[PDB]
């Protein structure tokens, strides 16, 4: 019903729990499959699979299993927010196919099940690496501009309060007449070089995922 891509434009960024380098494997698990657009801001994947193919993948990769496809469908729905769907996850960030290993283990005899996130669809890449990322970048920028207005107003308020009487007596902790550009000039050389921290997706879910969810509208 193409809700996999629709669920891949509003797709919440959930931090996958791994024993390896943790990537932002994010998916909208549906009853008719899912779309696991693994976007750790390093490499982009996409598991455009339906419920039947992924369920039979689990059944064939479970060596001796007698389970209905709905059982593994619920197993997948446990990864609707990809935190933990069982074992612990493990990504293969080497090629266009991400192997998200989910060892179906409950203390028995050997098992191994994994995802296969084939080449990411560039349209939905833009739906979580360009288009709403472009959107939230512009949103944050004009947010900083409206904050420039707000800071300028507060600076002029404090200043015009100082020379109009009732000036604070704690001169050693006050602030000089401030302006936004004074903040931006120091930011560009101190924080912007270090706030430029792509990481393994975690910088997105600590600071960018919230405003992304605020800009998932388009």
């Amino acid at each position: 019903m193409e809700e996999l891509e629709q669920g891949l434009l509003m797709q919440p960024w959930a931090w996958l729990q791994l024993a390896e380098n943790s990537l932002l494997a994010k998916v909208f698990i549906t009853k008719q499959g899912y779309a696991l657009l693994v976007s750790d801001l390093q490499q982009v994947w996409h598991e455009q699979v339906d419920t039947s193919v992924v369920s039979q993948r689990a059944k064939e990769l479970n060596k001796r299993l007698t389970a209905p496809p709905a059982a593994f469908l619920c197993h997948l729905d446990n990864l609707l927010r990809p935190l933990l769907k069982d074992a612990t996850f493990s990504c293969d960030c080497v090629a266009d196919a991400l192997i998200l290993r989910v060892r179906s283990e409950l203390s028995g005899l050997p098992f191994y099940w994994n995802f296969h996130c084939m080449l990411a669809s560039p349209s939905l890449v833009s739906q979580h690496l360009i288009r709403p990322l472009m959107g939230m970048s512009l949103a944050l920028q004009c947010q900083v501009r409206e904050l420039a207005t707000l800071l300028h107003m507060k600076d002029l308020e404090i200043q015009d309060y100082q020379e109009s009487g009732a000036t604070l007596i704690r001169d050693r902790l006050k602030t000089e007449p401030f302006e936004e550009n004074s903040f931006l000039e120091q930011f560009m050389i101190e924080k912007l070089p270090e706030a430029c921290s792509i990481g393994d997706g975690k910088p997105f879910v600590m600071n960018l995922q919230d405003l992304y969810m605020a800009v998932t509208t388009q």
Binding site: T66, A67, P68, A71, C74, H75, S104, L106
Partner: protein, 48 residues
Amino acid sequence: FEKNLKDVSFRLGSFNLEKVENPAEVIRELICYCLDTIAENQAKNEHL
């Protein structure tokens, strides 16, 4: 017998039994285990 694991009545056992030659022997086994029962969870009270 089946263990209800992972929200499914998964097959915990599938044991190919065979018809006994005569149930009397395993019945005698059952009634000697019954003597072990008779000495298992509330009579060594007398002892301790």
